[PDB]
């Protein structure tokens, strides 16, 4: 489990949560490529159940 | 046919009578179901439903 540690220390009994959206700003986005995945699926409307439609 | 007794039989002739029976139909019997096209990616349930309907 410790092999996956990404934080120095856990959350204490009461540490203040710092808000980082303090102003309404248009976002700039960066990623390592392929961090986003697009999952696509077919619609089998060519099946025999659908006969009046081309 | 009726049967009658005696010799005279005058003014006692009968008629003819043949009865009838009527055969009719009923309402059609159906298995009727609806499936969205997303449900036909795997069509196994659809075929097994057809068999159940038979």
Swiss-Prot record, chain A:
It is found in: Virion. Belongs to the P22 phage major capsid protein family. Self-assembles to form an icosahedral capsid with a T=7 symmetry. The insertion domain (I domain) plays an important role in the folding of the capsid protein by acting as an intramolecular chaperone. Interacts (via N-terminus) with the capsid assembly scaffolding protein (via C-terminus); capsid proteins and scaffolding proteins form building blocks that assemble to form the procapsid. Interacts with the portal protein. This is Major capsid protein. It comes from Salmonella phage P22 (Bacteriophage P22). The gene is 5.
């Amino acid at each position: 489990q410790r092999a996956y540690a990404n934080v120095n220390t856990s959350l204490a009994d009461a540490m203040a949560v710092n808000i980082l959206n303090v102003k309404d700003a248009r976002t700039n986005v960066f990623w390592a490529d392929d961090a986003i995945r697009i999952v696509s699926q077919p619609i089998p409307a060519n099946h025999e159940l659908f006969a009046g439609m081309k | 046919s009726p049967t009658q007794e005696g010799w005279d039989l005058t003014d006692k002739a009968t008629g003819l009578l043949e009865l009838n029976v009527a055969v009719n139909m009923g309402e059609p019997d159906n298995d009727f179901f609806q499936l969205r096209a997303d449900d036909l990616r795997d069509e196994t349930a659809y075929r097994r439903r057809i068999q159940s309907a038979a």
